[PDB]
Amino acid sequence: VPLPNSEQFYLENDRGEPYLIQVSWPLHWEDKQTGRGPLPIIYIVDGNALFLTATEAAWRRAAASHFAGGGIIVAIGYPLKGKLYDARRRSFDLTPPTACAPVGYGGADVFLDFIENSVRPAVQARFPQVSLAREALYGHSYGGLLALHALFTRPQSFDCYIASSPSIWWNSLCILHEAKAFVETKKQSPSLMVSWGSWEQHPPRWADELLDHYEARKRTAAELRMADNALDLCAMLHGCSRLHALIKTEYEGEDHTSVMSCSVSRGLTMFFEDWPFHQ
Amino acid sequence: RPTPVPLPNSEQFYLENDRGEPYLIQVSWPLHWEDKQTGRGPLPIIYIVDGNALFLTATEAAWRRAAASHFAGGGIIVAIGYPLKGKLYDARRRSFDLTPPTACAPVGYGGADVFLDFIENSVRPAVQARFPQVSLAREALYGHSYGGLLALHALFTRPQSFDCYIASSPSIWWNSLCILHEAKAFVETQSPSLMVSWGSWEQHPPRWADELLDHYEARKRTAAELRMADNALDLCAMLHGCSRLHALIKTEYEGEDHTSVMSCSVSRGLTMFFEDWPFHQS
Ligand SMILES: *[C@](O)(OCC/C(C)=C\C(=O)N(C)O)[C@H](CCCN(O)C(=O)CC)NC(C)=O
Ligand SMILES: [Fe+3]
Ligand SMILES: [Fe+3]
Numbered sequence: 274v275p276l277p278n279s280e281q282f283y284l285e286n287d288r289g290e291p292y293l294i295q296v297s298w299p300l301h302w303e304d305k306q307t308g309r310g311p312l313p314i315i316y317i318v319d320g321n322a323l324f325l326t327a328t329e330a331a332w333r334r335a336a337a338s339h340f341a342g343g344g345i346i347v348a349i350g351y352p353l354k355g356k357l358y359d360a361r362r363r364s365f366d367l368t369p370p371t372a373c374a375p376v377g378y379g380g381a382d383v384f385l386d387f388i389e390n391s392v393r394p395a396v397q398a399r400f401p402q403v404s405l406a407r408e409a410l411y412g413h414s415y416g417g418l419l420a421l422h423a424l425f426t427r428p429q430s431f432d433c434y435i436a437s438s439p440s441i442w443w444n445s446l447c448i449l450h451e452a453k454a455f456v457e458t459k460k461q462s463p464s465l466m467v468s469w470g471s472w473e474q475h476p477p478r479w480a481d482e483l484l485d486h487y488e489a490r491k492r493t494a495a496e497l498r499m500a501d502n503a504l505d506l507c508a509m510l511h512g513c514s515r516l517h518a519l520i521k522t523e524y525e526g527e528d529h530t531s532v533m534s535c536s537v538s539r540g541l542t543m544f545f546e547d548w549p550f551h552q
Numbered sequence: 553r554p555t556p557v558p559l560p561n562s563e564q565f566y567l568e569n570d571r572g573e574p575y576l577i578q579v580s581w582p583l584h585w586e587d588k589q590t591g592r593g594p595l596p597i598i599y600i601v602d603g604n605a606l607f608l609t610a611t612e613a614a615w616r617r618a619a620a621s622h623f624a625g626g627g628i629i630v631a632i633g634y635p636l637k638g639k640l641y642d643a644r645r646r647s648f649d650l651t652p653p654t655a656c657a658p659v660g661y662g663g664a665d666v667f668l669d670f671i672e673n674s675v676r677p678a679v680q681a682r683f684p685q686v687s688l689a690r691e692a693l694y695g696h697s698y699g700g701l702l703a704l705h706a707l708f709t710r711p712q713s714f715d716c717y718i719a720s721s722p723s724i725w726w727n728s729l730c731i732l733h734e735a736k737a738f739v740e741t742q743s744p745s746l747m748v749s750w751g752s753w754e755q756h757p758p759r760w761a762d763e764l765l766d767h768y769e770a771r772k773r774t775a776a777e778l779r780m781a782d783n784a785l786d787l788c789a790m791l792h793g794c795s796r797l798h799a800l801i802k803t804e805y806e807g808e809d810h811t812s813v814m815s816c817s818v819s820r821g822l823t824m825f826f827e828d829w830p831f832h833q834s
Contacts, residue, residue, distance in 0.1 A: 337812075
């Protein structure tokens, strides 16, 4: 039995690389044509890994009291079989260009161009009767790095950026350069949502785990520095002229993988129902 | 030419209870399996009530664990829902199925024992039949709101029925805190584990944008009466140092409401039960 009120299709970028675009719309709709007028839309990178959660989370909002009509979910993924991630494809698509970056990295701007010039029009054609009230870009890990990169380099492209556990550590904190250029530049501003799990930088010991293995995980966690890097960036963006609102959340007892469920669920909830955010 | 979205490594089937009331059972298994009959040996299983609302989240969250370091083959998801179209809840059915029996309960309530019997005597065998080569290593019961009230009711009245009980934002308020009677009886008389959770904005909701004060005060009135966080903490406090409880985990999710927290609790629930068993003696 297929998912209700959803569809998927393949788009190729300008270089002939395929993408699986998965789309869902409010469950109470009979057809796609049911929806009229302005609706919010969210674009989710690593689409395969999060489409179903974001879809069901959006449907669950129908029962909530602050439901305003819902919005369109767009998951941008890859053709996969028996797994949720394409390590090779995402490594290029989600990381910004740098001089010292190894091969198969630094294709963020190519991928963002694809989203704006291919995915957005394609989805808009599937809903001719509706207009895009506002657009959100969600990503987790390298996806979050892409979200931050998109904000700092093309802030007008999207209304809201949602960086779930962003890989700020990547490439000797290259994103902090762009963050500095963003704040130092002086000039409606978009919003930013940052989040991370509490067990990312400070993980507890597993039931089966021994000391050496645990110490190795702690050393890794310390190097990646998920929470502190995010706070450093958030403190850096505090009182910025080019940013309307900045929301930051720490999810208690959540690891890098588990927090994805929380961040994507709240991300679209806030964006759909609680727009605009207070300063 | 767009197509419908297929859900891989999953199937659904309908079951009747003894009373002849229909249920939609939705099952999923690890994504890396070629077939349903790929897996063998002991695997953990989680039963999720209000199945329609939580199946896809639990399914995909379980699949996401494959990428994590602490993956141990995964487990089986079982969502116990209803035949529905255009919504994720059946208010009438769930009102009966998820609430315990009391003398002062209105019409259409107090059918928890009927539903729990259905889970043990119908759902469990039906799932076991579909996975012959799999043995049920351990069983968890998850529920949210009334579902959490059912999970607590199940723990206090039939503790040996499941190994782990996960109560997400349990409706302890229901029927003048009638669950506290069962809770008191339980403590006063190995052991199963309990996972309790709630959202921070449930009992203390912030004001929405362009919300009239009158409307906001009405929401605060409800929040105060339902007393989600305090009731849960009060119940947890009572159960602490109980002989018939191995471990008790309690979490509060920052900036989460009654609906949104469901995503977190179900994800946390299956994660810990699948990967971090057995729990520390807390
Ligand atoms: C971020 O992208 O984490 C997500 C990793 C995912 C979704 C899948 C995966 O890792 N698979 C299938 O192997 C980054 C990724 C960093 C690159 N990496 O895989 C490393 O191992 C790096 C030491 N990770 C974080 C923690 O931000
Ligand atoms: Fe890796
Ligand atoms: Fe209600």
